[PDB]
Amino acid sequence: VGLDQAAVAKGLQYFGTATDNPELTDIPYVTQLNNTADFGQITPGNSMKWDATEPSQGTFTFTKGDVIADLAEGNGQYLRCHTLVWYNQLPSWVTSGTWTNATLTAALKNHITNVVSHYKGKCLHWDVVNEALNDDGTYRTNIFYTTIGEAYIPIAFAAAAAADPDAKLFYNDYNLEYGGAKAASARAIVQLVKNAGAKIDGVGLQAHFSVGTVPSTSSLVSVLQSFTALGVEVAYTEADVRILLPTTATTLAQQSSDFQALVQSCVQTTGCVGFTIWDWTDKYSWVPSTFSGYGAALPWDENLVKKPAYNGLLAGMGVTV
Ligand SMILES: *[C@@H]1[C@H](O)[C@@H](O)[C@H](O[C@@H]2OC[C@@H](O)[C@H](O)[C@H]2O)C[C@H]1O
Ligand SMILES: *[C@@H]1O[C@H](CO)[C@@H](O)[C@H](O)[C@H]1NC(C)=O
Numbered sequence: 001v002g003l004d005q006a007a008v009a010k011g012l013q014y015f016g017t018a019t020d021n022p023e024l025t026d027i028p029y030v031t032q033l034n035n036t037a038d039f040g041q042i043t044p045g046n047s048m049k050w051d052a053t054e055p056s057q058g059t060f061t062f063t064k065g066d067v068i069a070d071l072a073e074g075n076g077q078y079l080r081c082h083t084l085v086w087y088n089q090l091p092s093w094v095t096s097g098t099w100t101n102a103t104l105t106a107a108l109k110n111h112i113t114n115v116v117s118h119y120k121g122k123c124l125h126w127d128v129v130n131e132a133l134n135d136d137g138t139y140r141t142n143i144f145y146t147t148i149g150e151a152y153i154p155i156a157f158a159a160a161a162a163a164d165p166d167a168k169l170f171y172n173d174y175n176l177e178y179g180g181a182k183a184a185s186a187r188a189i190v191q192l193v194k195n196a197g198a199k200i201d202g203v204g205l206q207a208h209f210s211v212g213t214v215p216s217t218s219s220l221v222s223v224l225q226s227f228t229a230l231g232v233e234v235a236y237t238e239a240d241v242r243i244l245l246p247t248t249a250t251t252l253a254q255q256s257s258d259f260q261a262l263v264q265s266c267v268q269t270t271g272c273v274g275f276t277i278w279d280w281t282d283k284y285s286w287v288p289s290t291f292s293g294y295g296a297a298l299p300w301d302e303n304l305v306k307k308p309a310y311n312g313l314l315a316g317m318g319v320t321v
């Protein structure tokens with residue numbers, strides 16, 4: 001059995017992966033991306049972000065995003081559409097604009113309406129608002145927060161829901177798995193959106209970790225339940241477990257136990273619907289270009305061969321390997 005077959009057998013909707021357009025000329029890569037025994041879901045890594053979809057005010061370009069959407073439909077894989085509102089990968093007409101609350105609110109609603117309407121009925125989920133919090137649970141500064149204030153959040157959710165009523169709408173963030181101040185602030189964002197009368201369906205827990213910093217399965221379950229108690233679904237959205245290079249048999253074994261605890265916590269939680277890894281092979285991992293000296297974060301190595309973590313994920317979904 002593959003990862004998605006194992007997930008569906010334990011009542012998850014999917015096991016899936018991110019990818020990106022430049023990777024699709026690598027035929028051995030795409031042959032395994034197309035393996036629906038392992039992958040039942042796809043996330044576009046870059047080509048549905050604001051800089052990729054609205055490069056000048058009022059001009060939309062969907063060619064690259066459409067390539068990823070058509071591959072998912074071609075395979076019968078779910079699509080998580082990613083992402084509408086984020087501090088990172090904005091075009092300079094947004095970051096450098098002369099704005100008022102009124103003019104940036106209109107331009108934000110226009111962006112969301114055009115992009116969500118283009119993909120209407122194709123998106124199982126949208127990551128509507130991404131990374132709105134500092135490490136201490138205060139709001140992250142960005143042009144939306146300094147010009148519109150915290151209202152930018154329910155405005156984005158209400159604009160996405162009017163353009164595609166069938167998409168589940170997620171708030172997505174990292175380091176929520178530790179609970180404490182940041183998780184409490186992500187619960188408060190869920191309550192902000194409900195208080196405003198706007199639709200929110202989900203919280204995405206990105207599940208970025210350094211090897212050996214993942215807590216017990218029962219700890220993870222308690223944090224996931226703190227969100228499902230609000231009446232939202234949860235999912236792990238950008239999972240990777242990074243190693244300070246070079247790897248050893250010890251750190252590859254700890255990486256396997258770490259991925260095993262994360263997927264078991266999702267199996268055990270009612271309302272946790274699925275698991276996405278941030279690409280599937282060390283060959284194309286974002287980690288080395290972001291976390292200096294770290295790498296080998298994924299369940300397949302740079303030769304596209306399975307690592308110990310592949311069997312750890314199967315063990316966390318109750319398969320003997
Ligand atoms: C989670 C975030 O939501 C996601 O968009 C990030 O993807 C990376 O964004 C930066 C870009 O240069 C990389 O190619 C892409 O993988 C990863 C994480 O921050
Ligand atoms: C992968 O699947 C997509 C969609 O079905 C298809 O366009 C593509 O040609 C496939 N590629 C390979 C190498 O199997």
Ligand SMILES: *[C@@H]1O[C@H](CO)[C@@H](O)[C@H](O)[C@H]1NC(C)=O
Nearest residue numbers: 101102105146147148149151
């Ligand atoms: C912007 O406008 C909306 C709607 O009137 C409001 O909720 C928000 O508080 C305003 N923000 C600022 C900082 O002026």
Ligand SMILES: [K+]
Nearest residue numbers: 266267269272
């Ligand atoms: K579950």
